Design a protein around this nucleic acid. Structure first.
Lengths: 93, 63, 46, 221
RNA sequence: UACGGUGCUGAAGCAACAAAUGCCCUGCUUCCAGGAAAAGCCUCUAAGCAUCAGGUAACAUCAAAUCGUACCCCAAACCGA
RNA sequence: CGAAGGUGUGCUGUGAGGCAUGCUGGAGGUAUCAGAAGUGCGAAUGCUGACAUAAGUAACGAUAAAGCGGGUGAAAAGCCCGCUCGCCGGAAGACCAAGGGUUCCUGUCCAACGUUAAUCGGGGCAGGGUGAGUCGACCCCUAAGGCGAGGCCGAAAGGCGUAGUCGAUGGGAAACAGGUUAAUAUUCCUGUACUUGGUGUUACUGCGAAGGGGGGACGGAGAAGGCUAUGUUGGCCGGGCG
RNA sequence: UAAGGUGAUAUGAACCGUUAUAACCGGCGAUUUCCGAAUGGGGAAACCCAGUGUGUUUCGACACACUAUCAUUAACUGAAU
């Protein structure tokens, strides 16, 4: 009725591993599985209740390139997000 | 089977939902997202617990 | 060589996609015969 | 003393998957720490020992020459450089002399910083290539050929982890040791501090041998 | 400086000639072959409502969702068994 | 404590067949007489599978030449690097659509697979990567053209077709330059800008129709001309004398 | 109905019952996402775009229900006449 806790339940995972974790998962700029359409809204205002970030650029991108999860069997790719936002702060960890 | 809970009213079902559905994936299903569970069994009753919230909402009419 | 049938997706779904074989009762023959075969190929879709 | 490396950091980037399916077993290579500070010890051994020399050396020079480092009487120091560097402990806190506590405390911290830095310039610990040490392979079925670990693009992970292990808790330990003496203890508050640590690296050595001489428990690379 | 790479800096920085198949230009011109449509777009009233509401202007504010974006692409990513 | 079978040997019956018997084998198989047959294959360029040949015979795919020295490693024509050579270059450059759409980077691995050798590849296998009010698509508008309540035809089935509804290959807000990862990009960052639309506020104020008017709004050719990116030079500025 | 359990490959992880409170069976119930005859439109279904209500609203935005066609019927209004 004015906002929903439903998209304050958006956390699903921070990305990790090799290159692109460097300030891409830390500092300003953070990348993480965020809902499925995000909302570009309570994904920038649920960290504005947590770091106060009005978020330097709220971005989205659904995440792509090949099935696996038994890539030598048949694979399945359910698809997900990299948030790939830039936060405007990152300092209250 | 048959033999559980105590039933829950919908003036306090309220409170339950803010702890195992919300702000619980920010600490336990964020920390599922940050592992270290040799207590796998605890997680399964964050689910099956608020799954009883809405059973005792539609079954019992919020009672 | 270079062959005889080539992609067009600019008609595919509306050559036999769901509301293009539903569309026809006789393309719901297809789907009647695939509610008679349980084929994976249907409209060749999900 | 014992609640001073209890903490959980943990990294998995080491890869395995062998016999996939998540109730089959597992699927990864499963490294972690949980305990930290581990070559900065020998520094605060040195720092306390230096004061042991000064209290010794000064008293020796006192009753067989010139007071240069302090004045004694009653056995121990009563004055001088040697007093301001003496350790308060024995059964209870000394709150009578607060400036003594402040100078001694500052003195011990900086002395600990000093031998920690000399534990940089002569005998220390590596991160940069401790980084790169693991990735040639992860763990293979044999069959899955890693590159989750990246042979460089890991130096830093190491250079965040190590130190604090030659420095950077030398300060902190020297602090902890000092206030461990302001409380005071039997066997020495700092001696307890060193002893607990020596015992912990020891204890596990008594235990250590037994499991992997069946050829090792494995799959963590 | 690892020897992978990083730090530090900055002169000249124009004019002539000579320029484009680029553009003015849906131009202009010509010729008959005869050259969309709508939206966007502008304006007027109509019934009405009637100062109102609206409108108009200025200013300020807020908003600007949902997705793509790698890479081959005459090619080992297209097609050709 | 050795069934069946697989499988040697000896005897026997005209044969169909039968016996004796060894091995192997490691489980079952089974009078008589009586019952019932999917009851016997050398030819069908039969069917089907397994198994041959040629023959190591042919062959190893486009000539746009590389050569060398190190490296790695057990090993290099092909992996790695470097250094020396040829070729395309209105392409063989560099960028895209479609389609691929991960083939991509990265990191690994060599078995298989790349037309060989290969440590190597888009191979194999792990990770990592595509971020937008202003860029694009969703999105607004229209073509051909479709659908089409109702409607008008037609055994059923079913057709034609309205009000409408759909529908690109055509038309509807704005951002750029720098700078940036081995994976990014008008997307990230930076610097400096742009836009539209809603809200709000304010000031003034007549506003008001799927309506009306207006307007989008257009060919080809041809004849020119103008213009600039720019190109080339000189000059300049730096460096250099082989 | 029950002392052993915690679906399969899937072994694990952790737990559970802790033997009647696991788990199972049977009845009942709940949810039952997205699509789909699908029904607000669009529509190349699992998707695009939407309304109307009923709410909220912090005014930025935000929830919640309703909205098909076609048939049958009734009721109300009612041209050319």
């Amino acid at each position: 009725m004015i906002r929903e806790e439903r998209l304050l339940k958006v956390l699903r995972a921070p990305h990790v591993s090799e290159k692109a974790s460097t300030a891409m998962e830390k500092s300003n700029t953070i990348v993480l599985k965020v809902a499925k359409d995000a909302t570009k809204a309570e994904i920038k205002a649920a960290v504005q209740k947590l770091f106060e970030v009005e978020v330097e650029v709220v971005n989205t991108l659904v995440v792509k390139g090949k099935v696996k999860r038994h890539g030598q069997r048949i694979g399945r790719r359910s698809d997900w997000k990299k948030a790939y936002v830039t936060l405007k702060e990152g300092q209250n960890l | 089977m048959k033999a559980k809970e105590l039933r829950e009213k919908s003036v306090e079902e309220l409170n339950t939902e803010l702890l195992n559905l919300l702000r619980e994936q920010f600490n336990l299903r964020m920390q599922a997202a940050s592992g270290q569970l040799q207590q796998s069994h605890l997680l399964k009753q964050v689910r099956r617990d608020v799954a009883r919230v809405k059973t005792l909402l539609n079954e019992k009419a919020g009672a | 060589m270079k062959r005889t049938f080539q992609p067009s997706v600019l008609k595919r779904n509306r050559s036999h996609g769901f509301r293009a074989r539903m569309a026809t009762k006789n393309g719901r023959q297809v789907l009647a015969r695939r509610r008679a075969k349980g084929r994976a190929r249907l409209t060749v879709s999900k | 003393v014992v609640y001073a490396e209890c903490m959980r950091r943990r990294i998995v980037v080491n890869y395995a998957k062998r016999q996939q399916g998540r109730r089959v077993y597992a699927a990864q290579s499963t490294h972690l720490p949980l305990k930290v500070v581990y070559v900065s010890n020998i520094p605060v051994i040195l720092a306390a020992a230096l004061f042991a020399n000064i209290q010794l050396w000064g008293l020796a020079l006192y009753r067989m020459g010139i007071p240069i480092l302090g004045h004694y009487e009653g056995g121990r120091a009563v004055d001088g450089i040697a007093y301001y560097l003496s350790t308060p402990y024995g059964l209870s806190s000394v709150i009578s002399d607060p400036i003594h506590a402040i100078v001694y405390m500052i003195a011990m911290i900086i002395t600990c910083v000093m031998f920690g830095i000399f534990w940089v310039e002569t005998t220390g610990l590596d991160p940069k290539s401790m980084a790169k040490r693991i990735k040639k392979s992860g763990a293979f079925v044999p069959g899955i050929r890693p590159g989750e670990q990246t042979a460089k693009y890991i130096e830093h992970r190491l250079k965040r982890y190590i130190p604090p292990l030659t420095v950077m808790s030398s300060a902190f330990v020297g602090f902890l040791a000092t206030i461990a003496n302001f409380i005071g203890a039997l066997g020495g508050g700092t001696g307890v501090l060193l002893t607990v640590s020596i015992v912990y690296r020891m204890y596990e050595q008594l235990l250590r041998e037994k499991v992997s001489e069946l050829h090792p428990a494995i799959a963590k690379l």
